[PDB]
Amino acid sequence: MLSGLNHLTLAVSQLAPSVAFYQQLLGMTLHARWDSGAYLSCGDLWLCLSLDPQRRVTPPEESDYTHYAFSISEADFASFAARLEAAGVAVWKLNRSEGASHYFLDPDGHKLELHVGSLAQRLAACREQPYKGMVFF
């Protein structure tokens, strides 16, 4: 039986700017680095950056909707979004759902998000206003 997410691994084209982005800009903890990757943590999240010459720097119009959302408190959201904006980090979508969300790109075009709110919060909102065809279990 699966018990959770063990780790998220992102392929990166250049290790140094990716470490700078996740450690310095986003504030994650760097635990180890080797010639072809790094391990960081963000709360319970184990993040691995893996240097991969197959990784393309990918415009957001050229990738699908797969994305990785990080939790932040409502109180911290606006100042963290402003930090990303000051650093020139590109946005790939505007928020139109419940709970604050900021949709931003990593140096290789990985689709990231800051989100405030749990699954339980989302399900409660959906129960009140269900999406088209929605069924609950």
Which residues of this protein are in contact with ligand VOB, per CB under 6 A?
A: 33, 35, 133, 135
**Does 69 help bind Mn ion (rule: CB under 5 A)?**
yes
Of positions 24, 57, 59, 71, contacts a copy of itself by CB under 8 A: 71
Least separation in angstroms between CB 41 and ligand VOB: 16
End-to-end CA distance of the chain: 20
Residue 33: C-alpha distances to residues 19, 28, 47, 126 (Å)? 9, 13, 12, 42
Least separation in angstroms between CB 97 and a copy of itself: 10
Cβ nearer to Mn ion, comparing 10 with 24:
10
Beta strands 111-115 and 101-105, pairing class: antiparallel
Cβ nearer to ligand VOB, comparing 35 with 44:
35
Cα–Cα distance for residue pair 18/16, rounded to 1 Å: 5
